[PDB]
Design goal:
The structure is cut from a larger assembly and holds two copies of chain A, three copies of chain B and three copies of chain C. By secondary structure, chain B is an alpha/beta fold. Chain B has 15 helices and 17 strands. In chain B, strand 1 and strand 2 form a beta hairpin. Chain C has 16 helices and 16 strands. Classes of the chains: A mainly alpha, B alpha/beta, C alpha/beta. Strand 4 of chain C pairs antiparallel with strand 1 of chain E, so a sheet runs across the interface. The complex binds phosphoaminophosphonic acid-adenylate ester (ANP) (3 copies) and magnesium ion (3 copies). Chain D: Belongs to the ATPase gamma chain family.
């Protein structure tokens, strides 16, 4: 029962660690696209307000 | 009388008139072009000068060039003789078959039907497509929109609907190509000649085609939807007839408007769009409608920029629809076709009093198991299905079978699936999902439910495997 | 003379720039050569910027523009009841001209501090989750908010349909006249809505004000204010009105268009710097009046559409920061079968139990905090670990109440009927039932008390409370009924 | 008499579910 | 001297003068109006033209309409006779009780007290609210800010503070309603008449009220905070006595400024705000202060747009405070009221040398256990509670009890909670959290701690939840 | 020239990502209103009018053709970005090359599952 | 004055985030072009001019010094916002403080992992 | 920091001269004055700069942090021009160090902002690619010789995209 449990935890925790790693990449790339877009959108609002004057 | 060009930037041409000023929406004719160049009056600038939008390229235009007022908005041929013909944005034949000799013409700008003209009739239009028929069914004379990012399946779906619907239909159809692929127009045209729905020899054609594709400058892309609608309006009102209107792709209308708004020098709104995005859309959309006078079943493909459904263009389009089919790249990438998001597609006729309690309950049942499945996705992503409780594993396993049974081989996509196309009667769609939900197929493998028609094909498929 | 008249300098995108009109007042309605009207919004040294109430093809450079000497107004009064009008009060239902005998300005400042008194009279929706958890009083503003297709309009419709019960009576103090403002919607949708109200026999006490998607932006901008003024007629004459603004997201988009085209420089998200004030000045006009001012009221249910469930966004928080609470609907709850799809924790009433009958206050007293804690504890529990007796009880109760607060559409419930069902849950009679049989229980229980215990229901209604006698009578009914349902 | 063997600890896939009035392992 | 309106766009009115140009900040009176319409000079445009902000609606104004320079900024009634009265932005009575029978007036614009005028005295002001008194206590004469997104509890908290601190206050109070709900102004007014804090028939009133709510145009909303604080400045400097100043909501001052910024011809700063956000705020806030002449305990509700505390408006407000109470929708949504974030609320006097080491140690201990739990939550949501040592899961259970014991039923919130209001002495607050930390209630159910007053009620609740 | 002379040409645009950047430079300097990733509203049309010109002509026009192989550079495999989706929404399919496969020495690094040819099946020899 | 007279001075700028806000106000109102976060193009130059004046003088110049401890306020931990990025790059090192560290009981709330001093050991006694 | 960057730079300078007879140019773009001083003296001690004879192996070009945007934007081109002499006139394989390339891009962005040009995505200059390309393309092998360039790269927000 335990030999089966320890190897099944090995398999599960290896696979969990792999999934975590792949999700970290996905989230990091989501983070960065969002980071860039927030800067871009804020700047466009400023530019738009400025150009609309006088 | 006559005016002179004073300014040109892309699609935007300013024209000064010395004697009498043309009203907004008037079609002007540029003098001395090898092909007709129409400018549509958009604004009065002051000092006897109008700002206009060109319906074709403005290369070769010179300041001082003469422009004539036609005394009306763009007018196109409407009626029986448009059937089997292809026209452009300004109503010219582009099929090399000569004049379209209609007895009537109609301006492409017309006011939307008024509140008093609205029909409240609600009646199911069965497509034979399981996801749609079950979860978000189409209505006869209703407004249908097909949302999707680049390459997810909008056009395949509209083509399958033309196959499934536009033959069990005893009226007329209009297809408007708006900002899409010219070769897709060539494909459709020649396919219809082959099938016979366009007859080149007799007066039996039942479809009219109007095209202004992604090779066209923005004024043409912005107005060609109105050209198509106008052809549809004639058949709706003057023949009263049951009309199908297909548009691929209405997003291109709004995008084209963004291109011109940049040149019209307006202050931009969010995401660089025209400030007039919603009213422009409203004035066009409100004409795409059934009235007490006649029925238009409209199916519009709706491109989703960067897969973002919150983009102002698709976001604003939702409120104009009676039924939505929302496609998903993630679902496509899992191999589920049609790539419909079963939890983001809706229909006004999904109502127990319209579809019956059986249909309604099965649909809600399906959406409940799928949402329950979705709510477990964070943990499954990290730890997998094995870490879930008995109860949760049952819902996950049933939901995965339901997900797969929502997929379907389309006649139009046989090359890409390798499966013969299937059309599933409505009662069979209800029965199959009813049975899965009840646990009648808990013993059958997931893959047995993938890319089949009726539930019997899933059973026969499961028998083959093991 | 260019004092009382002017000439169009330019026209484009619903904005006319007009030379002259030296005597024009800020916000004055003017009339163009063709008959179209417009509002003077920009008084500049060399021109007037006029927003056009219609199609600008009907205006040309050189057209005369004439003073009206007046701000916009609308037809007002009971003759609008059962009618569909546009943003200016013109009939659009084909049933003839509106025989009203009073006019009211559209742009009037909300009553100040003195003319008001605290919200104290129930405004029953007939929706269990709303009436119990986020109750609405007469004179209150309560936002309905959520993504597309979450059931927002449906809350407003059922609320209108609920008032029939009172409106058929002769007690004018309990009556509620209804106003539905459609902004930016498609005409066929508004038509389907009117049909629904007509089939429920609710149109007779409802005014529909409609400025749809192909109506010019100024008209969509104006429609909420126009409907408001129609509601204020009731407010200021000792009567009670309810107004729905469906929706204010589309109104803000219309206002953004006009403002950008008037060349007013944009702010956050391209909306005008004063998009807050757009909504705040409108919603402030929903009020409860004191006795000296007639004791009337106007209650508002504005609607806001979120994107991807983000209640924390700019416009959504703007309007939450105006209203006296909000009902937040979530797509996830909707598809799980929680309908109405109300997120309890994120929804609030800023009037609370003061807006409830004593009977409802008795059964629902602590239920909202309870349900918010339930959901916290349900999330913490998820995995099958060691939960004590007290948390398991809390989870058991919360699951069963959540089922109890589910409801179908188009059958809004009398308050005494709501009270009877909530009673069964709150007193713990449902605790040992399977969660999936709770809806079945309620349907059978309700229909049983309706059929066989009209006296008990009538007494709870009349008294507006659960007497010690009613409490005992309910106890006998539920205990025996439960024993029958269980086995 | 059955009576079912596994352990106290999770995160081992289906170990517990595969085997599942006494029972050894919490 | 006389001018003529030359432009009207929303609240922004341009006026041309042939002779003497009015200085910036001067109040101008529009002629031919039914009610007094004040314009405040904001800019000199050149060409003998000034740009102004209107204090009321601009509908009905005509180009050419006469405008008189008053020769001064907006001046309002100050002194004892403001007590029990309600005034608007320009000092007119709005309570329908006739004239403010004062013979003393003050301009709403004034210089901030100098550095030499500052007081460094800081002693605790007990509120009887557990979370505040324990973790981020208020100081007498200090600057208190209550931050929150829409609907999270700013006003309920300020109303409870009014209940617990102001009702038994021996000096004067000023409440400034700035860009908020008129309904809340009416609620408050009648509550104070009931409590006797305002008296309509004698001279015993202890509260002066000033209102310019969200039904008003931005000019009124931009200046009404100054009106309210000018009233308070009088009581601080001329009566000397201890003043309480409540402002709901001071964000509305900055927002009003952003509404008119573009029309004043400014390039926007980030997030649509006026470039002058910080200096505008500074000139206003630096007047809201205790000095050597007198004490002002100021409590300001501070709105947080889009729930983002980095929004330039609230972000810039923090530096102006001695104690910050930060509310959170994520906490409110759980039913934890008051919805104070225990890990984002601070006070100058949270110092072992000021509050004593016992108070400080328990507060830091509470913050540690809560931060430790918060950092674990997401890990155990996936890996499971069972993976934790008995040490970690002990601090999870304890932290969840501490979270709950931080919640409290307010007297002003009875219509929302269904529970009777509770006020908890500082000693009892300290004792209760100390005991929970020490593990003295590890045997009690989580829920016994939720929505109670003193720790004895949790014990009592534990027995009640049994049978 | 070849297409309309009854001959067959192949054109590679290497690459359109850089082209769109150059066009964005021009557009921002022209002070046109930026949108998504600061690109102008006509950035779709920049590529659409170009790629529409690859075509197969009927025999009456000489039967010639122009085939286009536009190239797009992604960032971190993200096909859902603005310019990539624009181009996918123009072309008749894509060959997706994957960093992970390339690193593993799977070369050509083609993701078969995500690659598509929408119209190429009708132009594949029976033998293949 | 101390630096140039063979003496040693320590200056604290509390804080440079507020100084940059003041400069942005003036810049915007002078209608200078706005950039990221509405700051002007010379905002880096603003702080670099200031921070370069902190120095260690050789013995030939008297051997005095000026040490600077600028303060920067971040928003929600964003060390990569415009003004933080500027002053991070300008300086010889950074002491990073964190809210979760503070409330966990790490006070002073220094993230030792991220904090850096490029001068390092050269500034340390043998004992340390 | 602490990873031996300057020693590696000086050894590269040393090795290339010793083995190829090619000189180096160091362009400090956004140079911290303290670090410019340190580098100079470390180069004197290592012997890659000689103050007493003509045997120095590097030319230094410093554009310090306290200089205006224009100066910091152009100083890489100054370094490039010194390098171009050794390639195009003396037929050498030249090493050019740019420390650091991000501050080159940053100074270009500042310059673009000051000239009132509308910023691009993430606030960078619309000419980001062309500013980079016109500089980079000068670093290359030609028929006369080559310039090879080591470029210290800072990565904003640790975002490689
Ligand atoms: N129902 C389907 N069955 C099988 N494959 C499909 C299906 N729908 C789409 N596909 C695949 O996706 C490709 C593109 O489909 P299509 O319907 O042209 O997408 P679209 O959304 O119209 N693309 P675009 O117009 O470029 O934005 C097809 O060539 C198929 O390879
Ligand atoms: N309590 C309910 N029970 C069952 N169905 C409901 C309920 N409430 C709403 N629905 C259905 O949910 C769908 C959406 O409701 P609706 O009132 O249109 O929401 P909405 O958010 O206003 N939609 P939209 O404005 O079109 O984005 C409709 O088909 C309703 O029939
Ligand atoms: N202490 C509390 N106890 C119980 N319920 C509360 C408490 N505080 C707030 N609530 C609930 O949340 C609602 C909003 O609180 P309130 O103090 O009015 O919000 P606010 O932060 O001032 N929002 P706004 O004025 O819109 O910026 C109240 O009406 C109650 O329903
Ligand atoms: Mg397509
Ligand atoms: Mg709706
Ligand atoms: Mg409040």
């Amino acid at each position: 029962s335990t030999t089966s449990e320890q190897s099944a935890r090995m398999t599960a925790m290896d696979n969990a660690s792999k999934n975590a790693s792949e999700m970290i990449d996905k989230l990091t790339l989501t983070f960065n696209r969002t980071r860039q877009a927030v800067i871009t959108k804020e700047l466009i609002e400023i530019i738009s307000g400025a150009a609309a004057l006088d | 009388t006559t005016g002179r060009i004073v300014a040109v930037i892309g699609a935007v041409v300013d024209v000064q008139f010395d004697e009498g000023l043309p009203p907004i929406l008037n079609a002007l004719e540029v003098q001395g072009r090898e092909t007709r160049l129409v400018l549509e009056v958009a604004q009065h600038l002051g000092e006897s000068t109008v700002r206009t939008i060109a319906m074709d390229g403005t290369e070769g235009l010179v300041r001082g060039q003469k422009v004539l007022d036609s005394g009306a908005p763009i007018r196109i041929p409407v009626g029986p003789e448009t059937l089997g013909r292809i026209m452009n944005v300004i109503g010219e034949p582009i099929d090399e078959r000569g004049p379209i000799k209609t007895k009537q013409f109609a301006a492409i700008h017309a006011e939307a039907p008024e509140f008093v003209e609205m029909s409240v009739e609600q009646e199911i239009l069965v497509t034979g497509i399981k996801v749609v028929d079950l979860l978000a069914p189409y209505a006869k004379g209703g407004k249908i929109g097909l949302f999707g990012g680049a390459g997810v399946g909008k056009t395949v779906l509209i083509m399958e609907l033309i196959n499934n619907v536009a033959k069990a239909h005893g009226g007329y159809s209009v297809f408007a190509g708006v900002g899409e692929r010219t070769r897709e127009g060539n494909d459709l045209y020649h396919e219809m000649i082959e099938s016979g729905v366009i007859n080149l020899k007799d007066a039996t054609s039942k479809v009219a085609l109007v095209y202004g594709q992604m090779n066209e400058p923005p004024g043409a892309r912005a107005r060609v939807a109105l050209t198509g609608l106008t052809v549809a309006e004639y058949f709706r009102d003057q023949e009263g007839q049951d009309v199908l209107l297909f548009i691929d792709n209405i997003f291109r209308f709004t995008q084209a408007g963004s291109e011109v708004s940049a040149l019209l020098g307006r202050i931009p709104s969010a995401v660089g769009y025209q400030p007039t995005l919603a009213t422009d859309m409203g004035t066009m959309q409100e004409r795409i409608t059934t009235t007490k006078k006649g029925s238009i079943t409209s199916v519009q493909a709706i491109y989703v920029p960067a897969d973002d459904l919150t983009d102002p263009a698709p976001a604003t389009t939702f409120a104009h629809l009676d039924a939505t089919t929302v496609l998903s790249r993630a679902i496509a990438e899992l191999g589920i076709y049609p790539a419909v998001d079963p939890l983001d597609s809706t229909s006004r006729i999904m109502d127990p009093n319209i579809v019956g309690s059986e249909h309604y309950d099965v649909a809600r049942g399906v959406q409940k198991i799928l949402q329950d499945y979705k709510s477990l996705q964070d943990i499954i992503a990290i730890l997998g299905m094995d870490e879930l409780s008995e109860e949760d594993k049952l819902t996950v396993s049933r939901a995965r079978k339901i997900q797969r049974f929502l997929s379907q081989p389309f006649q139009v996509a046989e090359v890409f699936t390798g499966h013969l196309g299937k059309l599933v009667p409505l009662k069979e769609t209800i029965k199959g999902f009813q049975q899965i939900l009840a646990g009648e197929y808990d013993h059958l493998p997931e893959q047995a439910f993938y890319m089949v028609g009726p539930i019997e094909e899933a059973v026969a498929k499961a028998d083959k495997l093991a | 003379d260019l004092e009382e008249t002017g000439r169009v300098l330019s026209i484009g995108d619903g904005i006319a720039r007009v030379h002259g009109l030296r005597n024009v007042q800020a916000e004055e309605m003017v009339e163009f050569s063709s008959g179209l009207k417009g509002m003077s919004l920009n008084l500049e040294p060399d021109n007037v910027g006029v927003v056009v109430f219609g199609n600008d093809k009907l205006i040309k450079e050189g057209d005369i523009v004439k003073r009206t000497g007046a701000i916009v107004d609308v037809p007002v009064g009971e003759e609008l009841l059962g009618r569909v009008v546009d943003a200016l009060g013109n009939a659009i239902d084909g049933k003839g001209p509106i025989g009203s005998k009073a006019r009211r300005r559209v742009g009037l400042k909300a009553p100040g501090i003195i003319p008001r008194i605290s919200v104290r009279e129930p405004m029953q929706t007939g929706i269990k989750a709303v009436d119990s958890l986020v109750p609405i009083g007469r004179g209150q503003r309560e936002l309905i908010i959520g993504d597309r297709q979450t059931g927002k309009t449906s809350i407003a419709i059922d609320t209108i349909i609920n008032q029939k019960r009172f409106n058929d009576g002769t007690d004018e103090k309990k009556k509620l006249y209804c106003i539905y403002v459609a902004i930016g919607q498609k005409r066929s949708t508004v038509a389907q809505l009117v049909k629904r109200l007509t089939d429920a026999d609710a149109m007779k006490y409802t005014i529909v004000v409609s400025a749809t998607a192909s109506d010019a932006a100024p008209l969509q901008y104006l429609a909420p204010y126009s409907g408001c003024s129609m509601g204020e007629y009731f407010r200021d004459n000792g009567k009670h009105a309810l107004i729905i603004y469906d929706d204010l997201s589309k109104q803000a988009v219309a206002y953004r268009q006009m403002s950008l085209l008037l060349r007013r420089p944009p702010g956050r998200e391209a909306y005008p710097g004063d998009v807050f004030y757009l909504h705040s000045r409108l919603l402030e006009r929903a009020a409860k009046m004191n006795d000296a001012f007639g004791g009337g009221s106007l209650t508002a249910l504005p609607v806001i559409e979120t994107q991807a469930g983000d209640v924390s966004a700019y416009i959504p928080t703007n309007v939450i920061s105006i209203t006296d609470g909000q009902i937040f609907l979530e797509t996830e709850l909707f598809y799980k079968g929680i309908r109405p799809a109300i997120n309890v924790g994120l929804s609030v009433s800023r009037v609370g139990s003061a807006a409830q009958t004593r009977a409802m206050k008795q059964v629902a007293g602590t239920m909202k905090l309870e349900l918010a804690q339930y959901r916290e504890v349900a999330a913490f529990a998820q995995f099958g670990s060691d939960l004590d007796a007290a948390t398991q009880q809390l989870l058991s109760r919360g699951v069963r109440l959540t089922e109890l607060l589910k409801q179908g559409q188009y059958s809004p419930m009398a308050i005494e009927e709501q009270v009877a069902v909530i009673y069964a849950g709150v007193r713990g009679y449902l605790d040992k039932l399977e969660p999936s049989k709770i809806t079945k229980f309620e349907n059978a229980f309700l229909s049983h008390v309706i059929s066989q215990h009209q006296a008990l229901l009538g007494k709870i209604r009349t008294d507006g409370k659960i007497s010690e006698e009613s409490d005992a009578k309910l106890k006998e009914i539920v205990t025996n009924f439960l024993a029958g349902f269980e086995a | 008499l059955i009576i079912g063997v596994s352990s106290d600890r999770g995160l081992c896939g289906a170990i517990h579910s595969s085997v599942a009035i006494i029972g050894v392992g919490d």
